[PDB]
Write an enzyme that holds these catalytic residues in place. Sequence first.
Site, PDB file in Angstrom:
ATOM      1  N   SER A 197      20.494   0.022  -6.745  1.00  0.00           N
ATOM      2  CA  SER A 197      20.302   1.305  -6.111  1.00  0.00           C
ATOM      3  C   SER A 197      21.582   1.690  -5.391  1.00  0.00           C
ATOM      4  O   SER A 197      22.662   1.601  -5.948  1.00  0.00           O
ATOM      5  CB  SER A 197      19.131   1.213  -5.142  1.00  0.00           C
ATOM      6  OG  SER A 197      18.250   2.298  -5.298  1.00  0.00           O
ATOM      7  N   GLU A 324      11.840   3.905 -13.176  1.00  0.00           N
ATOM      8  CA  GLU A 324      12.563   4.127 -11.924  1.00  0.00           C
ATOM      9  C   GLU A 324      11.964   5.179 -10.984  1.00  0.00           C
ATOM     10  O   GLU A 324      12.065   5.047  -9.769  1.00  0.00           O
ATOM     11  CB  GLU A 324      14.032   4.477 -12.229  1.00  0.00           C
ATOM     12  CG  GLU A 324      14.775   3.470 -13.152  1.00  0.00           C
ATOM     13  CD  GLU A 324      15.348   2.284 -12.429  1.00  0.00           C
ATOM     14  OE1 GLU A 324      14.831   1.904 -11.376  1.00  0.00           O
ATOM     15  OE2 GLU A 324      16.319   1.715 -12.919  1.00  0.00           O
ATOM     16  N   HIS A 437      11.302   0.606  -9.636  1.00  0.00           N
ATOM     17  CA  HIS A 437      12.640   0.642  -9.086  1.00  0.00           C
ATOM     18  C   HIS A 437      12.701  -0.532  -8.114  1.00  0.00           C
ATOM     19  O   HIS A 437      11.892  -0.626  -7.188  1.00  0.00           O
ATOM     20  CB  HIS A 437      12.823   1.965  -8.319  1.00  0.00           C
ATOM     21  CG  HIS A 437      14.196   2.178  -7.761  1.00  0.00           C
ATOM     22  ND1 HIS A 437      15.301   2.348  -8.556  1.00  0.00           N
ATOM     23  CD2 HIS A 437      14.636   2.241  -6.484  1.00  0.00           C
ATOM     24  CE1 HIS A 437      16.371   2.502  -7.792  1.00  0.00           C
ATOM     25  NE2 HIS A 437      15.993   2.440  -6.533  1.00  0.00           N
TER      26      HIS A 437
HETATM   27  C1  LIG Z   1      15.140  -2.424  -3.999  1.00  0.00           C
HETATM   28 AS1  LIG Z   1      14.520  -0.600  -2.853  1.00  0.00          AS
HETATM   29  C2  LIG Z   1      16.113   0.932  -3.176  1.00  0.00           C
HETATM   30  C3  LIG Z   1      14.399  -1.117  -0.682  1.00  0.00           C
HETATM   31  C4  LIG Z   1      12.540   0.081  -3.616  1.00  0.00           C
HETATM   32  C5  LIG Z   1      12.462   1.597  -3.649  1.00  0.00           C
HETATM   33  O1  LIG Z   1      12.821   2.106  -2.370  1.00  0.00           O
HETATM   34  C6  LIG Z   1      13.090   3.517  -2.297  1.00  0.00           C
HETATM   35  C7  LIG Z   1      11.739   4.228  -1.894  1.00  0.00           C
HETATM   36  C8  LIG Z   1      11.309   5.281  -2.763  1.00  0.00           C
HETATM   37  C9  LIG Z   1      10.125   5.982  -2.523  1.00  0.00           C
HETATM   38  C10 LIG Z   1       9.363   5.666  -1.413  1.00  0.00           C
HETATM   39  C11 LIG Z   1       9.727   4.659  -0.527  1.00  0.00           C
HETATM   40  C12 LIG Z   1      10.904   3.894  -0.714  1.00  0.00           C
HETATM   41  N1  LIG Z   1      11.171   2.855   0.409  1.00  0.00           N
HETATM   42  O2  LIG Z   1      10.385   2.709   1.348  1.00  0.00           O
HETATM   43  O3  LIG Z   1      12.148   2.118   0.414  1.00  0.00           O
HETATM   44  C13 LIG Z   1      14.338   3.855  -1.397  1.00  0.00           C
HETATM   45  F1  LIG Z   1      14.848   5.060  -1.693  1.00  0.00           F
HETATM   46  F2  LIG Z   1      14.077   3.899  -0.081  1.00  0.00           F
HETATM   47  F3  LIG Z   1      15.314   2.970  -1.552  1.00  0.00           F
END
Ligand SMILES: C[As+](C)(C)CCO[C@@H](c1ccccc1[N+](=O)O)C(F)(F)F
Lengths: 528, 532
Positions: A197, A324, A437
């Site tokens: 990300s 994703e 994702h």
């Molecule tokens: C390996 As991660 C980039 C901490 C999982 C996805 O996280 C998204 C997200 C997308 C939609 C709703 C909530 C979230 N979230 O709480 O992290 C983002 F953008 F935050 F990273």
Amino acid sequence: SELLVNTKSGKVMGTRVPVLSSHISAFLGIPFAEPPVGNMRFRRPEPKKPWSGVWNASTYPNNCQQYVDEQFPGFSGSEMWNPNREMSEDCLYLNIWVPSPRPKSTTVMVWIYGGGFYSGSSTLDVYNGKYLAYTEEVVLVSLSYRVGAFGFLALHGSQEAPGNVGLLDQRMALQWVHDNIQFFGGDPKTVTIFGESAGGASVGMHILSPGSRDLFRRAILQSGSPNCPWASVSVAEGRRRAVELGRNLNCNLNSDEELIHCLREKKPQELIDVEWNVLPFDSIFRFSFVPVIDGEFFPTSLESMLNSGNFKKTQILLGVNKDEGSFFLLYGAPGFSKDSESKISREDFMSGVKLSVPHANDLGLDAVTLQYTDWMDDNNGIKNRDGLDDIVGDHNVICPLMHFVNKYTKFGNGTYLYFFNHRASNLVWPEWMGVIHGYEIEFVFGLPLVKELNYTAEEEALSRRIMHYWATFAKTGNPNEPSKWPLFTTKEQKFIDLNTEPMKVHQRLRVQMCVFWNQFLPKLLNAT
Amino acid sequence: SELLVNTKSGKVMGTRVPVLSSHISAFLGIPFAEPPVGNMRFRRPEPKKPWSGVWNASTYPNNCQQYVDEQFPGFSGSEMWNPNREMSEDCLYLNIWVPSPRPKSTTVMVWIYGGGFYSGSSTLDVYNGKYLAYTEEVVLVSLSYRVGAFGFLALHGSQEAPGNVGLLDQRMALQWVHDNIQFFGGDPKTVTIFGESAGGASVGMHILSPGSRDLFRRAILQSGSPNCPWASVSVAEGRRRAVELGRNLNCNLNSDEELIHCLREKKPQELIDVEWNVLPFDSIFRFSFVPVIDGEFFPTSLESMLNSGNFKKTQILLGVNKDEGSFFLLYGAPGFSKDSESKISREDFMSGVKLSVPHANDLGLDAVTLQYTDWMDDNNGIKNRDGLDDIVGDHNVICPLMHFVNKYTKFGNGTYLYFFNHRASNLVWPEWMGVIHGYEIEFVFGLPLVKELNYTAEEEALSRRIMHYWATFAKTGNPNEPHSQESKWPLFTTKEQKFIDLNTEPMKVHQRLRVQMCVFWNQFLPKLLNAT
Ligand SMILES: C[As+](C)(C)CCO[C@@H](c1ccccc1[N+](=O)O)C(F)(F)F
Ligand SMILES: C[As+](C)(C)CCO[C@@H](c1ccccc1[N+](=O)O)C(F)(F)F
Ligand SMILES: C[As+](C)(C)CCO[C@@H](c1ccccc1[N+](=O)O)C(F)(F)F
Ligand SMILES: C[As+](C)(C)CCO[C@@H](c1ccccc1[N+](=O)O)C(F)(F)F
Ligand SMILES: [Cl-]
């Protein structure tokens, strides 16, 4: 002892940690910079002042100030991404995992967390580097950087809040690894930066950035790339949002300094509470404060840099997850629920696309709709969901990365592309969300190996080969040890599926929709 | 006598012609207008003035002056569409086939040939109306109209060359039918006008035009509709073209008067030879002189008349052929040949969509390309060929017809939609061409019933049910026979949008004919092009 290391800035004492009925060294919370607090809020990081005595690196550091998610309190699927340590502006620390016996000048892998530049921690349970370092015998570093306004408030022209400082934090952590990883048994010449990300995007920015190119050898990008639509903004938009944050906190706006001094007087949560109010559109997968194309960290536009080959030439291994978009629709799009099949009506589909493509005009929105709608069955709820799950996923992650991959491969020295489509058997999210994702990460960090985490036998095996490909790429620039994962070429455009089934080789990853997103739509919007 | 008829204008003597072991009455070459010659060229048709004595109506008349196709000399497949009689500006006549013994007051069907408003004859072998009239017991009329510059030269404002005169020619044959078909045993209150290509577009234009509305009861449109991109032009575009035609023949261009007087001195072929030089772009499925949206025959844009329900409300039966574009790509697109599979390279595909969508900008062309390209297999010749085929067929025929049917149905009193996808076993064209534009006509006119034309038994069957659906539609306004054991052709409604395939297989009912692509052509592209 094995746990005592003399570093350039001072002495450090790690700790022995158990891992799969064995052990390895862990050095937690080593400072690579001066706490960016008080007068130093929003400013470029300063190298950590040497210290006398021994530094206690046996426990995790604080997490940086960020917007904590409370959509699903208690629920593990969301909380596993939230900070698990006290939050503090004093959060510029790094973690190192060193196999035992301490290796000699071995492969190094640096992890950069993601979370849209607004959030993220290095201490997460899924970023526990012991399984990867022990299994592959690599020195694993997990760094940290300021997020949200604290790392990206950008008022171009001032030296108080110039922007990109969160990216500069990452870069100083990299410098530290460079000046000091040798003392831990790591070869500074064989460093692989990898992340997902905003962390995968970060990786690409360091490949583009001249000031960061020489601090690493190779790169691994997971579900992200520099060109993503949500990963950067122009200097004027950065200033627009920074002024908008001042307006939201009743700050003096006569000058940059006056505005900056006012934002520093505010408690961390005060800034965080109005963080999303600066976004220009009502949207999803869009974050307030992110990197700026300032002409300094990034010399020219990401595209012009990519066209002219103005970037680090090396080997890259990157890829995307099958679904994703689902995480972002659940949180902000109507019709979507964590406790239902989330079948979308035609009405919620029309509004869902408006939320996924905020910058597009009506003609643009019609093009997206026409592209993702089956008109012989336009009231099918599954197709409207899955179809919306593709727009957000193709628009924000998959197509930007394929544009990146094809621009890079023209000047690069070796590309390896993957598509991760395995859904973990012990997934806590509903089935309609698919392969989410960020859920490849637990496989990259080898969590399927710890049996009490209830993964199938074939998932542990899938975790073991993903880790070996990662490490083997890190060590040689090729994930294959002498079924092969073929090189991605601009002629063939080959990539593999990353699942429990026997590896399969495909071609032209989502070319149909990506020709739309990377070529047609941008042309339409520019002309209209 | 059965063969001598006292029409309103004068007496007429027909001929007895044989048909499938029996006989019928035929009245060929009957005049319905004064020859539009000399100072009457480009002018609205005037009624044929009464004659004394008997008019010899035992032989087909003259075909109107038109561009003859010489792409494949001697080839039956293309020449079957060419004039089969002497060409003459004196071509305003009509043909009638009357069952023997003469019916009392039966169903009338008028045929309007097509051929892009630049060509066409009433005398072609495929339009021999004996089979349909004998078989379905109807009175079959075959009419004629001025084509090309002769019937559509449009200098708006001028009363010497006001345009739409070829459509007006049609309307007079129609008025004639109305004032005289009763003497032949036909019911003027029950006339169905049907046509293919520019003839189907002509039918729809009479459905829209206020002055033609009361001259017919029902309508059948085949592979064409009024709003087709090629079927009409604005008054400006009509004027430009007529000026460019004068410029091509070194004419005085000071006034419409002098321009029109110049063109009236030219020999007919002199005009035909420069006819295609007036078109805006190099293109396929685009004709020079066609109907003009003048504000007279057509009060307002075809679209506004369609939107506000300003048209004749009745029952309509219409449909399309599987591969409507192949004929046109073979004649004017690189890569296509009648002596090969015509596999198209990616390059030849790009140039093909340019020839197919001549009015579209770069962005437009890109959208078309993106819509009809399989990017995982973009070098596939077969796919590029079929892709291009569908582009030309959807753009020029199918989608404008779907737009029409969909609009008409909101106000109409019955709509029946068909998709003709049968490839005739004795076809002379190559396999890649598919179910070509114009090739259902031989089934409509019952050619498969003459054993020596070599059609299969099942093809004769298809032809019988097609003619029966057509006739029964003309008589009742519903192609289905009440309380019959046979499968049923369902009504086309805006909510269901049902239609049937027309082939040798047992009938099948489908829904939303080529929606995906038609939403693109009828809704998206126009918006895209409008934004510029
Ligand atoms: C390996 As991660 C980039 C901490 C999982 C996805 O996280 C998204 C997200 C997308 C939609 C709703 C909530 C979230 N979230 O709480 O992290 C983002 F953008 F935050 F990273
Ligand atoms: C005051 As809010 C209702 C947390 C602004 C947008 O929120 C998104 C969101 C929430 C969590 C992570 C990322 C996103 N996003 O990128 O838009 C959603 F989903 F709640 F609407
Ligand atoms: C029932 As006919 C409308 C007389 C057969 C197709 O006619 C087309 C055509 C299309 C492409 C190449 C040649 C021709 N042609 O010779 O008639 C045209 F032009 F009449 F519309
Ligand atoms: C001077 As020329 C080469 C007879 C104008 C365009 O020609 C067309 C054409 C020629 C004959 C009948 C119909 C068409 N058409 O519908 O486009 C094509 F296709 F040959 F180029
Ligand atoms: Cl300043």
